[PDB]
Design a protein around this ligand. Sequence first.
Ligand SMILES: NC(=O)c1ccc[n+]([C@@H]2O[C@H](COP(=O)([O-])OP(=O)(O)OC[C@H]3O[C@@H](n4cnc5c(N)ncnc54)[C@H](O)[C@@H]3O)[C@@H](O)[C@H]2O)c1
Ligand SMILES: NC(=O)c1ccc[n+]([C@@H]2O[C@H](COP(=O)([O-])OP(=O)(O)OC[C@H]3O[C@@H](n4cnc5c(N)ncnc54)[C@H](O)[C@@H]3O)[C@@H](O)[C@H]2O)c1
Ligand SMILES: NC(=O)c1ccc[n+]([C@@H]2O[C@H](COP(=O)([O-])OP(=O)(O)OC[C@H]3O[C@@H](n4cnc5c(N)ncnc54)[C@H](O)[C@@H]3O)[C@@H](O)[C@H]2O)c1
Ligand SMILES: NC(=O)c1ccc[n+]([C@@H]2O[C@H](COP(=O)([O-])OP(=O)(O)OC[C@H]3O[C@@H](n4cnc5c(N)ncnc54)[C@H](O)[C@@H]3O)[C@@H](O)[C@H]2O)c1
Lengths: 305, 295, 296, 305
Amino acid sequence: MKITVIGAGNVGATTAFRLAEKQLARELVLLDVVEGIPQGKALDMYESGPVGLFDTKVTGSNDYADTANSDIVIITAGLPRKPGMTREDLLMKNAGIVKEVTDNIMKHSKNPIIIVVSNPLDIMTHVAWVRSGLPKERVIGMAGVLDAARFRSFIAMELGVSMQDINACVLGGHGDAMVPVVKYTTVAGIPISDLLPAETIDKLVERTRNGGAEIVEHLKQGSAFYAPASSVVEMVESIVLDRKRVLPCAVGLEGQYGIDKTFVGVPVKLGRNGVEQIYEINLDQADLDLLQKSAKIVDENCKML
Amino acid sequence: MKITVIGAGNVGATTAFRLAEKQLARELVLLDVVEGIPQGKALDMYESGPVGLFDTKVTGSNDYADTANSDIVIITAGLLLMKNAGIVKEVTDNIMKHSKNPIIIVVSNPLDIMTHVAWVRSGLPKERVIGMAGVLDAARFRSFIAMELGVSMQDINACVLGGHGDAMVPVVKYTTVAGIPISDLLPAETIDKLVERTRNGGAEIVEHLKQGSAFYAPASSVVEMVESIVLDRKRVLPCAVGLEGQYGIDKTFVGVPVKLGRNGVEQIYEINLDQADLDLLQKSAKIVDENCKML
Amino acid sequence: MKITVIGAGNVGATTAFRLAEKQLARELVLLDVVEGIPQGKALDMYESGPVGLFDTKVTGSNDYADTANSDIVIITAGLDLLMKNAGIVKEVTDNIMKHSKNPIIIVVSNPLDIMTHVAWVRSGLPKERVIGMAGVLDAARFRSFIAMELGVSMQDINACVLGGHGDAMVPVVKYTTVAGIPISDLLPAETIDKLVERTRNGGAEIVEHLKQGSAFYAPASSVVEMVESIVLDRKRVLPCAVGLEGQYGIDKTFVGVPVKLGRNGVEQIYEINLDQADLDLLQKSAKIVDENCKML
Amino acid sequence: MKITVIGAGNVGATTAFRLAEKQLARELVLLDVVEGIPQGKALDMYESGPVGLFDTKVTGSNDYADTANSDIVIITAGLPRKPGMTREDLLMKNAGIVKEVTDNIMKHSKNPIIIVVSNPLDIMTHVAWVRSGLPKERVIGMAGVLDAARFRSFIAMELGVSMQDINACVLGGHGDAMVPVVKYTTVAGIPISDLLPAETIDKLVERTRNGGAEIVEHLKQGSAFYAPASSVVEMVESIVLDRKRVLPCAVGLEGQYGIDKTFVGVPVKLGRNGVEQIYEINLDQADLDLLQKSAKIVDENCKML
Ligand SMILES: NC(=O)c1ccc[n+]([C@@H]2O[C@H](COP(=O)([O-])OP(=O)(O)OC[C@H]3O[C@@H](n4cnc5c(N)ncnc54)[C@H](O)[C@@H]3O)[C@@H](O)[C@H]2O)c1
Ligand SMILES: NC(=O)c1ccc[n+]([C@@H]2O[C@H](COP(=O)([O-])OP(=O)(O)OC[C@H]3O[C@@H](n4cnc5c(N)ncnc54)[C@H](O)[C@@H]3O)[C@@H](O)[C@H]2O)c1
Ligand SMILES: NC(=O)c1ccc[n+]([C@@H]2O[C@H](COP(=O)([O-])OP(=O)(O)OC[C@H]3O[C@@H](n4cnc5c(N)ncnc54)[C@H](O)[C@@H]3O)[C@@H](O)[C@H]2O)c1
Ligand SMILES: NC(=O)c1ccc[n+]([C@@H]2O[C@H](COP(=O)([O-])OP(=O)(O)OC[C@H]3O[C@@H](n4cnc5c(N)ncnc54)[C@H](O)[C@@H]3O)[C@@H](O)[C@H]2O)c1
């Protein structure tokens, strides 16, 4: 198992390190455009192996040749969104980044599984997909796991119960595009609406909606990376160990939810072959409406490309 | 078990995060002098819990009141001797105002010297104030040998005494692969380079990073020490501790093998060093000693 | 942290070994009434330490003095079945209390609900510190069968199971899900019924295969999950056997319900909204558990 | 990765369970001749996955068809030295068991790595090897790791130091055939001769020599299985994760230590290809003599087979 992580920033490096430690791959390549950084971090990670008890070969590079024949490729290239940036501005920029990166990895890696993390997630996962030339089942984006994670931690603070016993159902994208399904959000199998007032739930849902902005507001510069990295790894783990986890990821639909082709966040079974099954849950009218509406917006922006 | 990490920078946050998922403490508090950074990083970590499967209560803060009654305090605060000494001095006086008997692990460079500063400020028995350094050097020495011989790092033991760089004293006779001395597996010339690369290991990362320093190995090294103490494992690890004669060195803090348990330093090991290594070790001790004097 | 495991049999030893590796205690004492068995198994476990990378001090013994001041004590001692095991749990508990003043006691010995009650009254401890393992295991089985049916990770399946073992077991279907999705949404009524039934007879299914003895790997893992919540103060919400004081219309009786496990033991008892059939099933059982206890 | 464990007894089952939890294989098969036991134990293991957090498909069987195409096969079949068995008697019985099993697995698996645990180890590993018809590099036995593990635990009790910082060099076989190399037995790199008196060291070496008997002495019936299981898994892990661990194992030599084709316990580097390197350590005259001497014993026993 060989894994390549494109982008040696906060999210890419944190992800590479976690992957190295869990020994999910014998070879891990950390690539970036800037010379130095990937070489440095990768070496720093490897040098921790004596203590972490892992022999994962972690190397840094600036040459896509080193990524040759990767079984899985994680794209975290780009840059968050400096304060004051425009939606369309970031879209064009990152669309370029993701396209360049994707064309490059396909030049040295055929049939890999691509996991996209770059923002705007839904569109970028689409972009990566179209450039990859692979079946949609091999290109997936990380977003829902992270939103579900924040949602769960907030519910945990509210009730004082372990986060391991909380399920948060989150479909769609981020911000107004996020579609949290309170109906399938449980605590030990019990729906949260059975336990908490609608008013409290609304607050938890909104904090989840702007969860990233909350981190940003504290860090002053940059953005969240521990939860995002952990989330990326959970997906990578299901694929490497063929666990068949059911996680909300950005995948290309083909009819489900009255949506076609567009990349939308939905519960899917992840295995060694990528998206092995897409679940179409019984959303309420409003949620299903928001989901179709947001997917339509994505469809538009994808034409702008 | 309540652990407090001072300094929410690269090593401190990386450490707190590893600490959080290993569930070595029920309460973990990240403190920094800058507002927002610790609160933000701590939240990011906590939000990782649903996925990392841990419930550790990680909180960020700028108020030492939140560090009250800490069992272990890790000081990673710092930007050199003069500036970090003031920082370590300020941090130590603050933690002691809210924690009466913690075990303090210092990582702020210059290590041996800073460890000494924290020790004197804390007013604690030297068995409860140690510095991290040797574990990291040993880890680097180990990864290089692993690259050289193509074997698992888990089966390599690297003995490293002294401080960093020139003051570092790797003991070749006690450096092995599956119990076999390296001088039995490699040309004395290759052993010299591996040794030198270990001496300049920290600078090798810096050069690559261009900004800041290494933190993944340093963080992992710190946690191994924390774990031995928390789980009372009695690991034998080289750390910076106050000597009382061993190696012909007294008072000064120096990197030597020690048995780490729930009570901190429960034993200092004095290994038979040859003339060359003992000379170096002592030489460095006096250097560390002059600096502490001028402080 | 000092944990004592009573009964060095299949469940007790498997539990001790798991505990030793996870390093949830500095001291782990395996005690049995049979000479040599615990000493041997504990030594074998300790010798695994260089490989499992743990330094947990696991020791075997036939002397309760070695269990002194234990924070947590796990009772797996047991070989009519009601009377014999009741005698054993009685003897074990009284012995435990002569050397430990305030431990958290986790009972595993069958018949669970009842043995948990026995241990509780003999211990003289607050009921929040005496619990029995049962629901976690039934739920684990219920979850493993669903995974076989749907081909999904067991980590994303939540099975709600209240009550005791066998016909006393009350699996709540509406609170059993896959990624938050009710199984009734994913499986036919018939398939769900068979899975529920296989869960009811889960224990006998293993026994039938082993001829002698019963399951121990899932039972041990289940116990450890409970111990971990307490040791690490995780506040997990797990179905365990505990003494009720009105919840579900049941009083005094020990029965399996969801509880919040923390460093202080049972920190909260959850009373979920059961449908009429399940609520009556739960109450029926509890009354049976209550009769047996009265006769003891 | 598919792994088969022949024998559902204490060491076989304990090994299967550990393998399942570590997720070292997506498929684990437990086979035995007795109907029931393997099915029951295997089901019990799988039913713990919801709690152990693994999805390893663990199945029990009495049909070698199920072991089809196993990447690794672990032989733990047998039932050695009763309270008065003959070294000869045990040798013949287990020799037939190991061959019957090896022939069976080769009919359903063509290029699997075989790891033997059945006693007498060195001899049974030789048997399995000849039958398998595979290169000697893919047939190894477990013995040195266990003796080394015991040796370390004893040194730990003696000095009050973590077992993780103790290295124990043990070559050869068990009992009289065991060749502990005090010279390469360390604590944080320090030779134990630098730390303990020759008198204490000898006591430690002899306890290691009769370590299995000490367990038997307490259990009254059967024998050790936790340490043995853990040892087998450490080897399996190095192979699966291609860690390149250096562990004392029973492998077919080809010259080193002045020993030819016989299986002897020596430090070897284990990777995905099995025995990737045999280390010939600088033993002292006495130890070197014991090694060749015992090796001869083995040759004599294999001859009359
Ligand atoms: N999926 C989510 O919900 C989620 C969560 C967090 C962050 N993100 C997004 O992930 C990205 C990375 O976040 P970060 O915090 O790690 O950022 P960062 O700025 O720390 O790191 C990005 C890295 O990308 C590299 N890079 C830029 N252009 C490149 C190119 N053409 N090729 C190769 N490498 C290139 C940079 O040099 C940099 O090291 C951002 O776009 C951010 O908005 C998404
Ligand atoms: N012991 C070793 O072998 C070793 C290895 C690596 C780094 N280090 C040292 O550790 C320190 C931290 O390294 P880093 O990479 O994390 O640095 P960094 O620059 O990323 O972070 C340092 C953090 O300290 C904080 N800080 C400064 N003054 C403070 C004060 N008075 N109180 C509380 N917080 C304060 C900053 O605001 C910053 O967030 C440095 O001194 C470095 O040289 C030692
Ligand atoms: N709660 C559950 O869901 C669950 C699951 C599995 C097993 N169990 C029950 O747990 C018990 C143990 O199961 P097992 O498979 O380990 O059995 P086992 O027969 O393997 O072991 C029982 C051990 O108890 C010891 N013992 C007997 N009397 C004792 C006494 N007075 N004091 C101390 N030790 C004594 C024996 O000597 C023996 O080593 C049984 O009663 C069984 O039915 C309950
Ligand atoms: N390598 C070491 O240092 C070491 C350590 C411990 C045990 N061992 C050896 O490992 C073996 C197993 O130990 P155990 O404690 O698990 O014993 P055990 O008696 O509990 O189990 C042996 C299992 O082998 C099965 N079996 C017998 N003949 C078989 C055949 N032809 N095919 C398939 N299965 C068969 C039995 O039915 C039984 O379940 C013994 O030979 C023992 O001496 C070696």
